[PDB]
């Protein structure tokens, strides 16, 4: 007695991604076809019916159940609407959607991080002992396949139908609070190419600059006080910049370990100089041992640091 | 003679919380029962009547209250609407809501400040002698209880009902212009990590950089110069940038004050410096006592002030 | 004849208030009555009409006037509709609406400008030989009145009631063309908190760090140059980012003046200093007789120009 | 036998400027009278439809057409919409129009440049030979020339009436593809005042700023050199910062030239005393004479060049 | 058998092209002609039936189908919607558009890049074999083909019919899973006039300034240092601004390689400089012949790069 409903859905294009709200649009087809009552249609060919014409239908008692997407931020934007009727019963439905998606999402290891581009399908007011989804295939690909959107897809899509178990109905329908539930999932993994340049290499450079005041002298202090600070301002403004594409989560990322690092080296090379200044009268002779090693102490430790961050991560 | 409303909300998420425009955004499930008139349905089975159909059975007579959410910044998106009509009677209103909401939010205690995500629920045109609000019950732990959103949910929720006068009405019920409330509220807590790494953390290093000065000597001016007028510059734009992310209030926050304090340490750690330079001729050797104790006075006085800021306003 | 119509306003409350685009969203409720011809209800009590079913009723030739909002930005988000029908005649349209207003403001005291939340409600298709306004009630007062909102709202409400001619509708309707048009006004004032933490201060310590060049010496160029540029090009950004929070207009505000006089003082600073090297050997023993007056001359033109802006504009 | 159609528009504000994307909002009443067959109104009055009820009226063959704004940007506003039907025959129609438009806009006399808020109002689906525009009056003043947003209303309104020839209807209107168009233009100009606040004369003081180095010396090389590269990077963000208000256009507008004149004296600046830098030692006695003529040289061109530039461009 | 289907689609303007998000506003009017069922007009005159009254027609069996645009962000801004019924049969389907579009953009040639706005229209519920596009006429050149706002139009339109496979409609139509699109594809170049005064120019006379340093001494440090640090600082913010108008992508544009030059070049420049620090004992005469030759090296490095790079990419 449950009627089972097959569902196609094909994705037309994955577009507006936006990482601090942890919302992405997704644009594309929907089709349920389940087998109804055989009825006449007029000729032995399928009636077609488009958007309006379809309320004229379901106020002669046809049955069309209202589908709804969970995982979606507010009323997605429904495009054309038709009906396939079949004289054997088979009632198709087929529409067009354009909502804007949500899905809970891990900045741990911001910016290698993998995500999940999901959609999550299930009816309203009909449960699984009233309606069932019998299949799910997601024929997402001969658009998608194209994956210079500002991520990278990885594998196909994974389709999985489970019961979804609503408290709030208990006390409506005894024993008949569960629902049936597509889900659609695409993995997907960042392209850290904008950021290398708009973070990471900034702050490489700035280190790179931070070390040269180890080659000037017991020289001016001007120049390696100027040095210190310019380095340690950019290096703290990096800091701050870094994290105005992220929402304002707790945890520290893979870039905020690396931002901390590089902000180590630069105020370490400030403090070196500032320490040989109060021993510029305990052993004093040209230059000083601390520089002697500092200007390789330094780049060593900070280039095997890199290497040991981009080994990992990768 | 009023109907008594049992009223059951699922919550599915709570998103978007914009601290500057005070709103926050609530997705979720509405459901509404009361005890009608008997009917004789189809069959033994209770009708359930969806979207567009509904609209056909008021204008037949059906009884179907207007519910309004009070504390909402504009419409709420309506999603599916459906009808489950009984034949002994009992209406049931269930529907899906997402809507911008919004609260009287206090920022003194910036960013460990405690604030209610608060729903605030009653009818439109009847009023508590002729539509009454039973109980409510929210089931919204089973998904809400996830918060990484921005915000640290601690503790249920809490349901209130209660009964507002409208002075407005009074015009066309004398006494009887008094409407029932649900009430849903959920405390949260802030996250402190995103302000520890934009401000925080930055003004204390600024502070740190700030008495670098003091272990230089009375050294070339230029030096301790360029530490003074750089570090006051950039802790005052660190007071500016600091205030952005909340809305034009006039009262001071903990972030505020906390600024005041390390904006006070870097421009005395200038003064103090400037005040050594109007003595550079009249009693040096090598330091003023000064600047012997202010290198252990700066950091004392400000470390000992961290101890008593994080013990408090926690 | 013409019919005389009760209007009375409920603001839920008052946000979003843009200074930018000149524009302000206020929600609340309205109610309009007037006197029709007497009916017989279902029962003594009133006949209650809901969003949709009013369609029924004015398709039915029932007279229900469309009344609009003048000073709105965009169609307003009118939320839910219903209709009070009394026995004795008297109907009554109670809708809750949610608009951004939008007003004539004068911005040359900013920040301590007196700005007016006006609506001005008229009705269309009517005009006051067919319809006019009998009187007007604001129940702004018991929620409204707690002023937390980025202004202080400073009494009640004021309401004024007039009658204005289109002439756009003469050529259609000669001496029978003037409307009815209820104003309300509340008046507030603006909260310099936001404003001194932003510009005042930033500005105050910035002229404050400008005198800092007198207090050193005929000494190192570098520095006093240092305390110079700096503090000029500080002044310059803060004088450009202060306006962004201002609409493009040409007259100078309060802010602008104060600011000048702040550019003047940091800027003459420098160009003493530039002064007093041109004079750094004709007339040379310590110092220039200019320097052991500016460390007294400026702060006491700087501090009774203070005391004389903040006397004034309070 | 072409159904002349009388025009009138009432400007209610116009408000939204937005130089970037070249559009504006326009906000007011229109009003469209053509006399049609005679009618018996209920009593000598006029009848009145309002928003609503006008669709079973054009359901009972009612010949209303559709009037369609050309240089819109979406789909406008649409407040009220009225009916008069009036007792001789002659149909108003009357309804509130609330549109971004658009127009183009040539700005190569930045910030001195003219621009008309143009309307071109044409009808839809009715041809010349169908319908044609008898007048049109712009009843605009009594609001619209009071201007306080960023913008001079300066005269009065121009109305011209035109027949446009639209080549996509031939296939489906061999020869009769003409519309009548109305075409409304408000010339109006530009308010220097942010712009001399915001980039003029902070351009002339960082000038102002630039010349300095003259007054010092062959002296530190570091305040003249902070002199120069502080003075050139400002101005260097200036002129990125000025267009930022601006279309990315290809023309260089007159604040453009301006910002490039300013320019060249900062770094000309700069590169006349790198050159006495390089001659410090070849034919040296106390001055370089160029820093004498310099200081002359350098102030004269410059408050000539405001001569030339001011008295142009007004 | 398939219903032949001629389409005209009239551009009126191209605006609001955001490189960000990819997309670009297209408003226009659309034709769409089909030869049908003959019927009786009123009259011999065509029939002209306007928005509303369509509803009327399709809902007594007219066959109206419904057209799509795929590339759309967005259900696009529909106008106003006209129905031309001859008495021969051929239905004429017209109505204005305003719709989002978007399309597949490479940014490897920025700013010389070149790009195509593109739009695709392709019908719903109907397939090849029941519904195919004859022609299409694309009349955009009237307000055309010379240049718009942001970009250079270069050349008219470019018509492409193309069948559409969608494999999701084999499970209900075998074979039949075909659909007649029609494409239309505008050329388009970008105006490096904006980019070259914000970013180019600015990168230039950054360079230029940076080679001053050369033209000191072995000086004063701090002024070479100040030149360095000031100089690599700038370059490296350039190098982020210069990327706010694009998409997170991961290749690198034309502009990103210039700034690497141009890094370089005020990078090496620091190098250097640092280098004779390390030799001012070391083979000291009054200059290191390296910044006597640097003086012309770097020049003619740097100008021969220009003349590469300008010479390419146009
Ligand atoms: C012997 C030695 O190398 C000296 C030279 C500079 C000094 C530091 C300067 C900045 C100081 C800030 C605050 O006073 C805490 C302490 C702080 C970090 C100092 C020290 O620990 C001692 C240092 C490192
Ligand atoms: C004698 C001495 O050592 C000098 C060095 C720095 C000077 C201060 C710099 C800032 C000044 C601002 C305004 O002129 C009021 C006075 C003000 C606070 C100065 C003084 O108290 C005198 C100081 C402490
Ligand atoms: C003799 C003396 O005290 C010198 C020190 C600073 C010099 C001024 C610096 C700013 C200059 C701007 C422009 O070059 C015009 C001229 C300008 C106002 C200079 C002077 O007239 C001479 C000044 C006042
Ligand atoms: C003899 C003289 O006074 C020197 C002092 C500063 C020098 C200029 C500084 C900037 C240079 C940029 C690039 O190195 C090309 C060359 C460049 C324009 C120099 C010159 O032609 C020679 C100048 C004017
Ligand atoms: C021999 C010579 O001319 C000296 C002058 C400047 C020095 C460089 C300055 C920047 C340094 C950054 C980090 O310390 C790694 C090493 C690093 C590249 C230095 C060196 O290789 C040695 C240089 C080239």
Known sequence: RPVDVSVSIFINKIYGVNTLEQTYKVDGYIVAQWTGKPRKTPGDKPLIVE????????NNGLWVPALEFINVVGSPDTGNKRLMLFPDGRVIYNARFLGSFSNDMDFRLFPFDRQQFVLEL????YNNQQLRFSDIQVYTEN?????????????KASTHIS????????????????FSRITVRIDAVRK???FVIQTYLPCIMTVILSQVSFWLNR????????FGVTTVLTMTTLSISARNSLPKVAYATAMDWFIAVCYAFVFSALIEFATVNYFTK???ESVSKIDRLSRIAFPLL????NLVYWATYL
């Open 219 to 226: 020289e001016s202090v001007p120049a390696r006080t100027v």
């Open 282 to 284: 305990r052993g004093v």
């Open 51 to 58: 958007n309006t014409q379809i309320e004229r239908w379901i």
């Open 122 to 125: 299930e009816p309203f007011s």
């Open 302 to 305: 900070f280039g095997i640091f």
């Open 143 to 155: 658009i998608d396949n194209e994956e210079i959107d500002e991520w990278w897809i990885r594998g």
């Open 192 to 194: 850290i190419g904008y």
């Open 163 to 178: 019961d979804i178990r609503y408290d709030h109905l208990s006390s409506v329908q005894p024993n008949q609070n569960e």
